[PDB]
Curated annotation (Swiss-Prot), chain A:
Highest taxon of source: Eukaryota
Protein name in UniProt: Large ribosomal subunit protein eL15
Functional note: Component of the large ribosomal subunit. The ribosome is a large ribonucleoprotein complex responsible for the synthesis of proteins in the cell.
GO cellular component terms listed in the entry, alphabetical order: cytosolic large ribosomal subunit
Gene: RPL15
List of residues that carry Phosphoserine: 33, 96, 99
Organism: Oryctolagus cuniculus
Keyword Ribosomal protein: yes
SUPFAM superfamilies: Ribosomal proteins S24e, L23 and L15e
Swiss-Prot record, chain B:
Biological process terms in GO annotation: translation
Example of a GO MF term: structural constituent of ribosome
Protein name (Swiss-Prot/TrEMBL): Large ribosomal subunit protein uL15
Feature: compositional bias, Basic residues: 1-29
From Swiss-Prot, chain C:
Compartments it resides in: Cytoplasm, Cytosol; Cytoplasm
Coiled coil: none
GO annotations of cellular component type: cytosol; ribonucleoprotein complex; ribosome
Role noted for this protein: Component of the large ribosomal subunit. The ribosome is a large ribonucleoprotein complex responsible for the synthesis of proteins in the cell.
Organism of derivation: Oryctolagus cuniculus
Bias-annotated ranges (Basic residues): 12-30
Annotated PANTHER family: 60S RIBOSOMAL PROTEIN L36
Name of the protein described by the UniProt record: Large ribosomal subunit protein eL36
Gene that this sequence comes from: RPL36
Residues with PTM N6-acetyllysine: 61
Subunit structure: Component of the large ribosomal subunit.
One of the protein's GO biological processes: translation
UniProt keywords, alphabetically: Acetylation, Cytoplasm, Ribonucleoprotein, Ribosomal protein
RNA sequence: CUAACACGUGCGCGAGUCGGGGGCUACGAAAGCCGCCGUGGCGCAAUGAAGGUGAAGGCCGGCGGCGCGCCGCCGGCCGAG
RNA sequence: GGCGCGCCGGGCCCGGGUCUUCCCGGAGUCGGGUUGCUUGGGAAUGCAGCCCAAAGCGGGUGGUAAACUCCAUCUAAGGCU
RNA sequence: CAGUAACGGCGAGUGAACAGGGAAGAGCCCAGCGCCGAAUCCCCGCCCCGCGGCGGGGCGCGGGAAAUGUGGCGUACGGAAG
């Protein structure tokens, strides 16, 4: 099948063929606006890996997030307090640019539901991402029993609770000995279970 | 019961059992265990020696189940098995020694403290002291290992 | 002598007859398939090589293997991936030498 | 606060001691009248009635 | 300000703990709610075992507990395929399966296979349609004598084999157990460097001969 | 007032002890019961940084070992200052 | 409303064992360097920015950095419950 | 487990997990590799039924989606075909 060939093709990003393609697509996507609808994926294999099926109701946006860290949004210097919290410009944000790219399109289309997202191009000052979305009130998915799970009202705005593949990876979430501080639902549920007194009746 | 407590006798007494010269102020010596090396050094060295400083090797992912090896002494060795076995061992003219599995009772290691009564045994354990196994040899009896 | 099973020692542990089960099917993930090899070498002849990989080939041609190892280790990370990339580049230079000699 | 220690736990053996003492004192005639039950016409106060 | 003598101690009440406190005054409310839910489930699965499916003999890991035997997650599918029970039909007829468990041994596998066969001898499978019976099915007069059992199905006992009082052989009274333990400790501790020094002595003898 | 600790007192049991978590059967959200629910806590063992080790002995007979009259190893006896 | 039965109509014509031959995996992602935050996680537990950026008897984990060397263990970079 | 391993001007303070006992208990689905004449889906028009959770069937040389891949089998417990 062609998808194994184009998967191994997109794996060789340092090659001259894919380097030419990445810089041409990056030129075009940098010229074009910030959040516009792509008509069809640039990565048809990767979209199928992440969940996209070419049927009526799945909508692909490519959006650019402005690349870089996160300096502290504070007047001039003047973060008032102890010299621990005097950091301004070398601070880094807890979530990733791909998750920010998911939630910007998920907020721009509040009717639709962000399924997942992937990488298309980058330069020194932008990252581009194709976030793929699902129209949850279309009858080509509300009559399909293996994708009507997203039409349920529980999964409203997965991108902003951080339930996607790139929104998940900043929660410290997983099995192991590496992820002791998130057992329970989250690193807040872990903290909340640990910092309570179970004052019983009898004691 | 507040009916029995001290504050019922300290009504009318204008300092409530804390003094007029030195009033009951809030935290006169610092909160908690404060001032270990500075102004309570006399207390922490007359009553808690060794409290300050590091000693010994740091062992990071310690698991208290790897080092599980509970001990039993020989004077309570016969308390593992019911009385009928040792009575029949005292009555047996064959020389059939009773078999005692200490791991079944829940002690991995046998140490030898007390006097052990003079009738044979087959003591099977997971570890042995030097003195314990030779007390078992001195009563005349075998030390079977088990993993 | 007596050889009781002991909790400590060279052959420590309780004696249990180990059965021979066929391995689980998750364990073969990454064992190279003929079709996958035929895809990957074709993709390499379509694309070519990375710039650091061709510069490491340029180091291996002039037989300075040690700084080529250090270069590949600095570019890819671990020393195991460094030696694996070294032996694959040595194989592609061995193929290029025999192809230019034949 | 609500987390005042409202409850008390008692050992099982002296919970049993207590009801044994209550039952055993419910058989003495002086210890029932001093509790207050007007009893003086009862046939016998460890009083067993028919199973019917 | 510590007094004369006592433990110097670390109470973890420096945080704001009164906001996050769990009072347990709904303890008997949950101990009524759980048994109401349990009675409702035991009425809902009407002849089926009230505890649930059957769960296998397992050994604990981790040296402290390996003498004991627990109930496990589910019967391993290696332990199913040699008992003759299909991996999908087991969970239908009431046999818990997990595919994650290996089988390092043979004694445990034979015990779980014997346990599955002893279970399969005891289940009373009702017909899937009550009028017409089928082949994989129990007899009609056994259907009236079915009832829910309480507690775990075939409860796991931790049974010990008692040895009889042997006569001590002279071969057993020469077993120096402490010195044997200590010699085993030293051999297991030193086994690598013995072989390394044997290796270097071998190639230095090659150096002296060649 | 809650929690931890220390000591003194009263109560039950006692080398054990405790169901506090779970379960089974108006007052009662109580009370009873479990024991192949003692898992577990504390205690019954200490010491060492650690590998670790881990809490009386005595007597008899035989075999300058001789220029252990002192036992290496066994059979018997007394036995825990 | 639920568990109960009968009828019409519609979907589906469905399984197991043995042998032979084939086939099998998620990439600017893992990982590495550095910086900042966080963690009990200590020669770096997790998260993120930038730079380098893979492999397929491969990759991760095996709580002290690293090289050789066997073992054990799961199968990431997709999704529901 | 445990106020433990550990962290901390190793000062004050901070501080989990594995194991065991319980409550509950349930597992699964794609992309890929493939094979089946796109075998798949949406909408409008007419007829029959029901229609206050717009659905079931029949007819459309009626319109689109989709080969830049929909459906059926199939997913690491292996799987497909003969
Ligand atoms: Mg500060
Ligand atoms: Mg979820
Ligand atoms: Mg990551
Ligand atoms: Mg006065
Ligand atoms: Mg006073
Ligand atoms: Mg005054
Ligand atoms: Mg004062
Ligand atoms: Mg004064
Ligand atoms: Mg005060
Ligand atoms: Mg000073
Ligand atoms: Mg004072
Ligand atoms: Mg005091
Ligand atoms: Mg006292
Ligand atoms: Mg403790
Ligand atoms: Mg911060
Ligand atoms: Mg933060
Ligand atoms: Mg911090
Ligand atoms: Mg190590
Ligand atoms: Mg996966
Ligand atoms: Mg997953
Ligand atoms: Mg200091
Ligand atoms: Mg903190
Ligand atoms: Mg656990
Ligand atoms: Mg249960
Ligand atoms: Mg499917
Ligand atoms: Mg397909």
């Amino acid at each position: 099948g062609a998808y194994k060939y184009i998967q191994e093709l997109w794996r060789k990003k340092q090659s001259d063929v894919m380097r030419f393609l990445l810089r041409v697509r990056c030129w075009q996507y940098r010229q074009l606006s910030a959040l516009h609808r792509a008509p069809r994926p640039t990565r048809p294999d990767k979209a199928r890996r992440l969940g996209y099926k070419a049927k009526q109701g799945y909508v692909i946006y490519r959006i650019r997030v402005r690349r870089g860290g996160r300096k502290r949004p504070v007047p001039k210097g003047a973060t008032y307090g102890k010299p621990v919290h005097h950091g301004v410009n070398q601070l880094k944000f807890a979530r990733s640019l791909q998750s920010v790219a998911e939630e910007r399109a998920g907020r721009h289309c509040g009717a639709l539901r962000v399924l997942n997202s992937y990488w298309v191009g980058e330069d020194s000052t932008y990252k581009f991402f194709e976030v793929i979305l699902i129209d949850p009130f279309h009858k080509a998915i509300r009559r399909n029993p293996d994708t009507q799970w997203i039409t349920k009202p529980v999964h409203k705005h997965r991108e902003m609770r951080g339930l996607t593949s790139a929104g998940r990876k900043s929660r410290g979430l997983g099995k192991g000995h590496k992820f002791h501080h998130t057992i329970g639902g989250s690193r807040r549920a872990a903290w909340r279970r640990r910092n309570t007194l179970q004052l019983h009746r009898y004691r | 019961p507040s009916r029995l407590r001290k504050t019922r006798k300290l009504r009318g007494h204008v300092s409530h059992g804390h003094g007029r010269i030195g009033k009951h102020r809030k935290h006169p010596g610092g909160r908690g265990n404060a001032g270990g090396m500075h102004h309570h050094r006399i207390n922490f060295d007359k009553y808690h020696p060794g409290y300050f400083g590091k000693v010994g090797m740091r062992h990071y992912h310690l698991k208290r189940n790897q080092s599980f090896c509970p001990t039993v002494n020989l004077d309570k060795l016969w308390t593992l098995v019911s009385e009928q076995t040792r009575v029949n061992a005292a009555k047996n003219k064959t020389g059939a020694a009773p078999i005692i599995d200490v791991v079944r009772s829940g002690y991995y290691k046998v140490l030898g403290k007390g006097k052990l009564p003079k009738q044979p045994v087959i003591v099977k354990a997971k570890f042995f002291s030097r003195r314990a196994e030779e007390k078992i040899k001195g009563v005349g009896g075998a030390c079977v290992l088990v993993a | 002598a007596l050889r009781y099973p002991m909790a400590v020692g060279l052959n420590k542990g309780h004696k249990v007859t180990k059965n021979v089960s066929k391995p689980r099917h998750s364990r073969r993930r990454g064992r190279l398939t003929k079709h996958t090899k035929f895809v990957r070498d074709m993709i390499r002849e379509v694309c070519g090589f990375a710039p650091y990989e061709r510069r490491a080939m340029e180091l291996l041609k002039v037989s300075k293997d040690k700084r080529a190892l250090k270069f590949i280790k600095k570019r890819v990370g671990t020393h195991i991936r460094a030696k694996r990339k070294r032996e694959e580049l040595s194989s592609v230079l061995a193929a290029m030498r025999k192809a230019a000699a034949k | 606060k609500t987390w005042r220690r409202w409850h008390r736990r008692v050992n099982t053996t002296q919970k049993r001691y207590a009801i044994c003492s209550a039952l055993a004192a419910s058989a003495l005639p002086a210890l029932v009248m001093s509790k207050g039950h007007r009893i003086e016409e009862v046939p016998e106060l460890p009083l067993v009635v028919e199973d019917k | 300000a510590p007094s004369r003598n006592g433990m110097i101690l670390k109470p973890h009440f420096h945080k704001d703990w009164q906001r996050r406190v769990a009072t347990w005054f709904n303890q008997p409310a949950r101990k009524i709610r759980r048994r109401k839910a349990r009675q409702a489930r035991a009425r809902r699965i009407a002849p089926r075992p009230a505890a649930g499916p059957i769960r296998p003999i397992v050994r604990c890991p981790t040296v402290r507990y390996h003498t004991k035997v627990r109930a496990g997650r589910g019967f391993s599918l290696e332990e199913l395929r040699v008992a003759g029970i299909h991996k999908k039909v087991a969970r239908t007829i009431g046999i818990s399966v997990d595919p994650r468990r290996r089988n390092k041994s043979t004694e445990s596998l034979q015990a779980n296979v014997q346990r599955l066969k002893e279970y399969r001898s005891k289940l009373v499978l009702f017909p899937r349609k009550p009028s017409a019976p089928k082949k994989g099915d129990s007899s009609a007069e056994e259907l009236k004598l079915a009832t829910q059992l309480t507690g775990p199905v075939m409860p796991i006992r931790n049974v010990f084999k008692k040895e009889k009082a042997r006569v001590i052989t002279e071969e057993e009274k020469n077993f120096k157990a402490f010195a044997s333990l200590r010699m085993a400790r030293a051999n297991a501790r030193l086994f690598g460097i013995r072989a390394k020094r044997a290796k270097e002595a071998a190639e230095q003898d090659v150096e002296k001969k060649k």
